[model samples]
Target chain A: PPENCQDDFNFNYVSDQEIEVYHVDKGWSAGWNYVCLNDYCLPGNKSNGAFRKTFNAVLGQDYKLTFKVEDRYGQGQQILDRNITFTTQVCN
Target chain B: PPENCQDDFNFNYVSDQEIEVYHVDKGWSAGWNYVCLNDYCLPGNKSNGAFRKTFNAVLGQDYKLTFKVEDRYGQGQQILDRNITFTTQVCN
Candidate 1:
């Protein structure tokens, strides 16, 4: 990963109550990698209620995902985080 | 797999021109799983247009996902369906 970078994720702060954010960090090495969030992942570009993000993963290794949330005024509040780990294999 | 269960997916038939729907069937077994759709998955409960569904899956497992749509008035017009399959694994 790159050196301690600020705002490595170019998320947009859209409102006084919430913001729209997404990140696809490619600084990690090849093979299995992962992403996580400590905050709630809402749906739509904006003006829509909250919903989670969905995607896929690889096998034979571990993955970590995290998310963080901040107030509309760029204040860090109502923060939340979640994490899960699982292995993968070809289905019979 | 479960016996040919009609509407095994409890998707709500809404609208006269368009409708809202979602499904979660536990008829499959443990291990890696996956889901996908041919039509666009919109955001919001309703009135928000379209958005896709996002979630994670395991590695090396052959998973098939499909979706279908019909005109709201139960006219069965403008029907649509899509299917996809892929494998899953772990993060390196």
Candidate 2:
């Protein structure tokens, strides 16, 4: 969702592809071009990937932000398990 | 979930890597191996990545499934977006 943004939600479910996932606030659709996020991942080795943009909430509303890490058959079927959560209160 | 599944949620924000994404039903955790999914993408050239496993709902429960796709920056910052939805009813 930056000046130039390219993210693929042209995603393939039931399968993975060469991609990383991010979530933007559903409230952040005011400037969406449908072609990318309001802000997006940068070049690797040069920068890093960015998922989950910031947006305000209706306070009592419940929302979900889901995104992901990886896969490639260059290896084969694999396994990895992780449970992580962070608490950051971004208040106005 | 099938048999052998290896997926990475060990993802990074702000950059992309060699990866693919998928979502599994939260209700289908009776047998989770963390190292992988119940089953997974075969070899590309061999198979493909699989996302969204089927799970039963608790009637009124609401849930979300998210996952994503790619970037290499081997190209540069770019854009891609897709909106798709599918519904299937499984009856016992």
Candidate 3:
């Protein structure tokens, strides 16, 4: 459920044009999804907005964003997705 | 000066997925800009369309697209641009 994003630890803004979502525990993937960024852009078109989360402190350990992006379009859907992972850290 | 930005160009269809517009002269950076790509997405929003030029053969030499992208917004304008280079080969 989207409730999983309730534990967002911290985020460092690399730039205003990027979406860097981090998780405190092993829930980064669980927490955020395409629908989470509040925005999405498709083939040079508008779709979604940035992840506008209310920032707070770490729930336990830490999270960092090292990402790989693969994008393609099939049928009328898109495969613009990211595979990201963080340290095997703990959650509060 | 926008007219000088014009060049008879060569474009390769990398996939039905990219825009690899190569210039016959040292003018790749010329023809394409915000006013060109036909399609452009701005910060999770649609702004332009992809360059939908009719497919054709190589004008000459080689131009492969290896790009470095830096995106930022100023006032209401976006700075999403590319720097591409080809061999110093002559155009037919």
Candidate 1 lDDT score at position B7: 30
Task: Provide interface RMSD per model, one decimal.
Answer: 19.4, 12.9, 11.7
Off by over 4 Å in 2: A1-49, A54-56, A73-88, B1-92
Query: Candidate 1 lDDT, tens digit per residue, A1-92?
Result: 22221322323323333223333332222122122333323331212322224334333223333333322122111221222223321111
Residue-level lDDT of model 2, residues A14-44, one tens digit each, is 1121222233222222222111212332311
Candidate 1 off by > 4 Å: A1-50, A59-61, A77-82, A87-92, B1-92
Per-residue lDDT for B1-92 in model 1, tens only?
Answer: 32322332222223232222333432222122222333334331211232123434333322233323322123121112222222221111
Which docking band does candidate 2 fall into?
incorrect
List per-model TM-scores for chain B: 0.28, 0.21, 0.23
Fraction of reference contacts reproduced per prediction? 0.00, 0.00, 0.00
Q: DockQ numbers for every candidate?
A: 0.01, 0.03, 0.02
Best by DockQ: 2
lDDT of 1 at B63: 27
Provide the DockQ value for model 1.
Answer: 0.01
Off by over 4 Å in 3: A1-64, A68-92, B1-47, B50-58, B70-92
CA error at residue A13 for candidate 2, angstroms: 29
